[PDB]
Amino acid sequence: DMYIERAGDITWEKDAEVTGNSPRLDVALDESGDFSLV
Amino acid sequence: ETTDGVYRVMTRKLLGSTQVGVGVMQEGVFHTMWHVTKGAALRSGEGRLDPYWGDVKQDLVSYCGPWKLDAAWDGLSEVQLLAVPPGERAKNIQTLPGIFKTKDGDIGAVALDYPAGTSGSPILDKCGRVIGLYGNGVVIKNGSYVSAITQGKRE
C-alpha cells in the first residue's frame, strides 16, 4: 500500500536557484506513454 | 489530510520507507503521474484515496475527482520545478523550458535531473499555478535527463 505525506506548499520562491538549459528536441510518444528521441 | 499542497508518495513494500514519487493536492483532488502509482489506491492517514481518472499515454492520474490543474506554460517566461527529492526537503529550482517537438504538437520540457522518487513534482509559473508535472521525458545525446511539462485537461 502506498501512502502520501505532505512536503510543502505550492509557491513560487522569488530568490530561487537558476539552472538547466532550454533544449529543443524532436520526440515521439508511444502508446505506453514513453518518450523517445527522433 | 486533504490540504492543498505538494506531497510525497511513500511505500513500505521494499526496504524501509521508500519514496516512489510526488504529487499535488488541489481542490480536494490528488494529482500525480501514472507510472508512480500504476493507478493503485493510496492512503492519506486513516483515509483512502481512490483513483478517479487515468491515462497511461498522458502518464497522469487523479484521485477523488477529475483533474483540476489547468494552467499551461506561456512558452516565454521561466518556470520553477518544485522538486521534492527522496530524503530531502522541497527545493524550488528555476529554468527556462525547452521544447519537445512532436507530430501532435509542441510541449514544454524542463532540463533538470533528479532521482526517481521525484516523479510527479509540480512545475509552476510565476503566479504559483501548477502548469504540469515532472518525470516523463527522454535522455539526451549526453546522458542527462529532460522531462516534459506534462499537464492534463480540466473539465
Ligand SMILES: *C(=O)[C@H](CCCNC(=N)N)NC(=O)[C@H](CCCCN)NC(C)=O
Ligand atoms: C520518476 O519515476 C522519473 C523521474 C526522472 C528520473 N530519471 C532520471 N533522473 N534520469 N521518471 C522516469 O524515470 C521515467 C519512467 C516513467 C516513464 C513513463 N512511461 N523515465 C523517463 C525516461 O522519463
